[PDB]
Amino acid sequence: GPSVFLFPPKPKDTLMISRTPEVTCVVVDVSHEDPEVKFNWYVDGVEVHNAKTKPREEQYNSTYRVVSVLTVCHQDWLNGKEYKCKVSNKALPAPIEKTISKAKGQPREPQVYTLPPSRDELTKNQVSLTCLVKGFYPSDIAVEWESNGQPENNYKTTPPVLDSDGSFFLYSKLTVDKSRWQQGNVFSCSVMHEALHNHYTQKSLDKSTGKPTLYNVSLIM
Amino acid sequence: GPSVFLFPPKPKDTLMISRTPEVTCVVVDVSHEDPEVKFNWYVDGVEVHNAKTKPREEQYNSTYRVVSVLTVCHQDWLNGKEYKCKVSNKALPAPIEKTISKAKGQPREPQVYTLPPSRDELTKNQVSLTCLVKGFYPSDIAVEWESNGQPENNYKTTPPVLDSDGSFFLYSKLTVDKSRWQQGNVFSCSVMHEALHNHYTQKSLDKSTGKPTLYNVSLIM
Amino acid sequence: GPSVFLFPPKPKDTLMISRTPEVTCVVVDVSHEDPEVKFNWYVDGVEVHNAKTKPREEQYNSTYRVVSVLTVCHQDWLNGKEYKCKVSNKALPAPIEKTISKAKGQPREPQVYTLPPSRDELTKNQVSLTCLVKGFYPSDIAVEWESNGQPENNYKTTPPVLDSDGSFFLYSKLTVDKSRWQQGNVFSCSVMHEALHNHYTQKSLDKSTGKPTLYNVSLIM
Ligand SMILES: *[C@@H]1O[C@H](CO)[C@@H](O)[C@H](O)[C@H]1NC(C)=O
Numbered sequence: 001g002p003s004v005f006l007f008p009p010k011p012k013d014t015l016m017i018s019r020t021p022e023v024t025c026v027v028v029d030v031s032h033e034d035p036e037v038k039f040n041w042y043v044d045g046v047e048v049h050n051a052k053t054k055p056r057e058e059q060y061n062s063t064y065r066v067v068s069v070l071t072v073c074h075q076d077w078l079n080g081k082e083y084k085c086k087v088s089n090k091a092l093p094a095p096i097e098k099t100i101s102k103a104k105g106q107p108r109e110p111q112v113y114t115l116p117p118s119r120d121e122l123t124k125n126q127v128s129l130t131c132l133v134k135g136f137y138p139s140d141i142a143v144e145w146e147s148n149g150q151p152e153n154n155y156k157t158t159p160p161v162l163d164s165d166g167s168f169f170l171y172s173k174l175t176v177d178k179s180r181w182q183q184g185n186v187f188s189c190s191v192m193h194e195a196l197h198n199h200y201t202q203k204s205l206d207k208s209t210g211k212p213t214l215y216n217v218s219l220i221m
Numbered sequence: 222g223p224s225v226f227l228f229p230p231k232p233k234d235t236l237m238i239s240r241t242p243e244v245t246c247v248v249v250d251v252s253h254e255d256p257e258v259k260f261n262w263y264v265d266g267v268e269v270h271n272a273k274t275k276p277r278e279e280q281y282n283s284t285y286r287v288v289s290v291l292t293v294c295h296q297d298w299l300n301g302k303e304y305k306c307k308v309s310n311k312a313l314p315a316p317i318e319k320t321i322s323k324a325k326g327q328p329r330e331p332q333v334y335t336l337p338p339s340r341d342e343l344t345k346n347q348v349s350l351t352c353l354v355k356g357f358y359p360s361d362i363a364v365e366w367e368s369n370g371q372p373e374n375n376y377k378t379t380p381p382v383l384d385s386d387g388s389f390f391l392y393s394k395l396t397v398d399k400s401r402w403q404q405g406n407v408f409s410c411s412v413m414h415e416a417l418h419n420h421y422t423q424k425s426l427d428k429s430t431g432k433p434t435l436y437n438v439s440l441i442m
Numbered sequence: 443g444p445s446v447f448l449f450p451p452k453p454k455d456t457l458m459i460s461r462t463p464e465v466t467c468v469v470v471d472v473s474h475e476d477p478e479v480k481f482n483w484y485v486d487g488v489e490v491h492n493a494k495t496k497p498r499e500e501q502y503n504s505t506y507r508v509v510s511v512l513t514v515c516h517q518d519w520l521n522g523k524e525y526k527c528k529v530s531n532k533a534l535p536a537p538i539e540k541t542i543s544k545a546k547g548q549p550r551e552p553q554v555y556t557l558p559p560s561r562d563e564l565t566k567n568q569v570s571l572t573c574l575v576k577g578f579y580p581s582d583i584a585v586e587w588e589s590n591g592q593p594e595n596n597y598k599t600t601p602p603v604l605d606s607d608g609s610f611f612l613y614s615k616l617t618v619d620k621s622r623w624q625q626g627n628v629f630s631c632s633v634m635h636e637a638l639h640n641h642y643t644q645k646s647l648d649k650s651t652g653k654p655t656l657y658n659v660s661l662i663m
Pocket residue numbers: 216217218
């Protein structure tokens with residue numbers, strides 16, 4: 001019958017209280033002869049009926065795609081609860097199940113450092129801001145830029161990369177224009193990792209004197 | 222017959238991911254003729270079975286006390302979903318039902334400040350550290366002190382007090398010995414309020430009353 | 443069967459000469475059949491005819507209530523003179539005598555330390571100062587605020603909180619226009635308590651009480 005996948009929740013959703021995390025069981029390549037799609041979610045051997053069933057979606061190759069969204073709770077996912085998606089279908093001869101949980105590795109606290117642009121790139125119209133996040137295990141991590149408490153969109157982030165000690169490390173290149181950088185604006189890097197206390201951290205990068213790299217102080221003594 | 226209370230979960234438990242939030246409903250004044258009690262837990266009317274009942278405690282007034290604890294979800298409680306501990310017992314002509322939820326309102330974020338001890342304080346055996354938490358809403362915060370990631374215990378916190386502009390504020394004195402203070406220990410105060418980003422903030426305090434304020438700024442370049 | 447309540451004066455009144463401490467005796471449950479009441483007092487067994495009685499009041503319970511007020515010189519209350527409230531009511535099988543005097547406990551002098559506001563608040567248009575009080579027994583104390591001999595009213599005080607050593611401690615944040623604090627206006631926190639010398643003390647504040655005078659500045663490069 002139709003293939004059934006599994007989607008883990010975004011680690012940013014799982015590590016943030018304000019965000020709702022979801023465990024997703026998607027079905028792909030479903031024919032029109034079998035529109036009946038059923039799910040049975042078992043958490044640690046306990047069936048849960050709280051799942052929400054999204055509408056089916058038709059692709060260009062005339063296949064349905066029914067999305068099974070289950071609202072997961074952060075304490076559950078972080079503590080090691082197994083989530084079983086038992087789907088019984090007409091086109092499937094037998095029920096299909098897939099097991100998903102969290103990575104049961106040894107947590108390692110990320111170290112976050114922010115680096116100002118070097119003077120080489122101070123000639124262009126847009127400077128690059130670097131957020132080094134090294135020494136964290138595992139790769140379930142997310143990073144974004146915030147300026148004066150509001151989100152920043154013009155940035156990218158390299159995927160985590162294996163290191164010498166077996167941990168991971170990744171970067172985040174924030175492209176702001178030269179003027180806003182040169183006004184002394186405060187840019188902050190936000191990193192959410194399971195090993196971090198409160199699953200959050202922040203580093204600030206001022207223009208001249210907050211981080212001493214170029215020095216000119218009107219000291220108030 | 223018996224009577225039923227309702228304990229909201231601690232704000233420290235609710236606003237911290239690693240902690241376990243729970244709604245405790247307490248039944249006291251239970252006679253010997255009806256010692257067995259049934260707990261039906263509802264979250265917006267939906268029954269749950271994950272509540273862990275507790276052994277009876279025989280009170281000195283010739284009665285019992287049986288308590289059932291439901292571990293709530295952080296998203297569920299902090300959103301404002303209702304919680305009803307329905308207690309069924311033979312003695313009660315009508316089973317007791319009470320409902321508790323998060324205090325609805327406009328959550329104004331706190332503005333944490335920290336105040337180093339006055340100069341007159343450093344002439345005593347122990348100093349006191351002030352962590353002002355002003356202008357928040359509502360009055361559900363637990364404040365704890367930390368030192369280099371270690372917990373602090375010798376501190377007290379004033380109950381939240383009203384503020385002229387309708388908000389709240391509160392205080393916390395950290396009693397530490399003067400010697401550790403005078404070395405240059407990095408003491409920090411930890412707040413957890415629902416209106417913050419990640420519902421957590423930490424304010425640093427060190428020997429200097431700010432960088433350009435105290436005895437000398439030994440510039441090293 | 444009337445009941446004779448008795449209430450001490452507010453401690454703020456008793457500690458300070460200008461305000462008037464008073465003996466507030468209440469006769470409650472005064473039936474309408476025998477509503478006429480006679481008031482008597484003893485000062486260590488001596489009748490005094492210098493008191494005044496507030497007029498009769500009506501309540502929602504179809505009963506009567508009266509309150510009488512006797513002027514007390516602060517010395518008599520301070521050294522524990524005995525005040526007894528006698529009521530000669532016609533609905534009484536016997537006169538009721540209630541004895542009130544100074545609530546004698548051990549005294550410990552409050553140690554008033556005032557703390558300047560932190561620079562983090564200095565960005566706001568309002569600034570909150572602090573007058574910590576600690577190590578005093580018992581918890582009956584009034585803290586006021588003044589500047590240039592003129593009292594301020596934009597202040598709030600937290601209720602006393604028990605300390606580790608059995609004493610108490612409390613705080614008093616007062617908010618001012620930032621500019622008013624910026625020219626180094628003085629701000630004295632008055633503390634009135636029995637254990638203090640003269641039942642009164644004060645500690646001042648100034649833009650330069652957090653900014654010292656010694657500056658051993660060093661430039662090592
Ligand atoms: C340093 O900053 C001061 C701020 O008053 C400014 O006037 C001065 O030109 C600056 N000097 C530099 C950038 O060399």
